[PDB]
Write an enzyme that holds these catalytic residues in place. Sequence first.
Site, PDB file in Angstrom:
ATOM      1  CD  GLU A  81      -3.017  -1.141   0.185  1.00 58.13           C
ATOM      2  OE1 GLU A  81      -3.034  -0.026  -0.484  1.00 58.13           O
ATOM      3  OE2 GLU A  81      -3.853  -2.020  -0.004  1.00 58.13           O
ATOM      4  CG  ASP A  91      -7.985   3.712  -4.631  1.00 53.57           C
ATOM      5  OD1 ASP A  91      -8.407   4.242  -5.686  1.00 53.57           O
ATOM      6  OD2 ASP A  91      -8.698   3.031  -3.983  1.00 53.57           O
ATOM      7  CG  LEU A 124     -12.029   4.040   0.482  1.00 52.55           C
ATOM      8  CD1 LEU A 124     -11.594   4.709  -0.819  1.00 52.55           C
ATOM      9  CD2 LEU A 124     -13.023   2.942   0.149  1.00 52.55           C
ATOM     10  CG  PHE A 135      -5.963  -3.805   4.256  1.00 44.78           C
ATOM     11  CD1 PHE A 135      -5.517  -2.903   3.285  1.00 44.78           C
ATOM     12  CD2 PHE A 135      -5.914  -3.424   5.605  1.00 44.78           C
ATOM     13  CE1 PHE A 135      -5.046  -1.632   3.641  1.00 44.78           C
ATOM     14  CE2 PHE A 135      -5.389  -2.186   5.976  1.00 44.78           C
ATOM     15  CZ  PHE A 135      -5.002  -1.277   4.987  1.00 44.78           C
ATOM     16  CB  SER A 153     -10.385 -18.788  -5.343  1.00 44.97           C
ATOM     17  OG  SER A 153     -10.525 -18.332  -6.682  1.00 44.97           O
ATOM     18  CG  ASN A 191     -10.682 -20.261  -9.671  1.00 47.92           C
ATOM     19  OD1 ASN A 191     -11.361 -19.713  -8.802  1.00 47.92           O
ATOM     20  ND2 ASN A 191     -11.159 -20.597 -10.839  1.00 47.92           N
TER      21      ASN A 191
END
Length: 162
Positions: A11, A20, A32, A104, A117, A132
């Site tokens: 990040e 972002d 965010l 996250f 998955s 996948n």
Amino acid sequence: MNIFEMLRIDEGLRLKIYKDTEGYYTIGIGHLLTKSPSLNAAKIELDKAIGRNTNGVITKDEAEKLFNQDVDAAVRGILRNAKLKPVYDSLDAVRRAALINMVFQMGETGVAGFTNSLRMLQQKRWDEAAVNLAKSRWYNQTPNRAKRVITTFRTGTWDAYK
Ligand SMILES: [Cl-]
Ligand SMILES: [Cl-]
């Protein structure tokens, strides 16, 4: 390496409001603020998150405090989620961190959406799961980060981050 060091690499750290990869107003370590296009609405969310008039700028301690909260919320959201919890419980420590990373980034609902998955991870079919996971918008939009997470699920080591 641990979940905090992993996400700090993925990040980065920014002390001024920024957009972002999706164009949303964010600050700190991937925190965010709002999906709204108004920078002002972002400033309001920020001051409210910090508890002071920031004018779009925060300090490193303030960034780390939002990060601590965000990691804690990601973990608690996984444990509360009926789809996520069983997968988390089945995984070893390293792989648990990869799932936290995904939550996250995309949120609990988003991750829970990777139904097939998730079943593969639960079954310990590493290679199949990795293939996948890559057939997703996620992978196509942020390939370098997705590859790092996917390799983490595939190997159960921190090699992609070293
Ligand atoms: Cl908050
Ligand atoms: Cl990327």
